[PDB]
Amino acid sequence: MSKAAKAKKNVPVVSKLEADARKAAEGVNDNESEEFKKAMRKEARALVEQFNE
């Protein structure tokens, strides 16, 4: 019906800020603290008693 150059070569913006803080995360590995573990032992035993009553 009609021809043929409606389409053009427009180019979008070059905004590439999608990597804002992906790498910025602190590099601290999974260092399992001991104090947390005894604390949760205590808390879990408390809630087990709670289950009991």
Partner 1 sequence: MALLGKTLKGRSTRPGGIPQKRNIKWRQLAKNQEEFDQLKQLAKMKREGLK
Binding-site ranges for partner 1 (CB under 8 A) = 32, 34, 36-38, 40-48
Smallest separation, CB 32 to partner 1 (Å): 6
CA angle 43, 44, 46 (to 5 degrees): 65
Residue 25 CB, shortest distance to partner 1, in Å, is: 22
Nearer to partner 1, 20 or 49 (CB): 49
Using CA atoms, how far apart are residues 49 and 36, in angstroms rounded to an integer?
20
Q: Is the dihedral of CA 25, 27, 30, 35 positive or negative?
A: negative
Query: At its nearest, how many Å lie between partner 1 and the CB of residue 28?
Result: 17
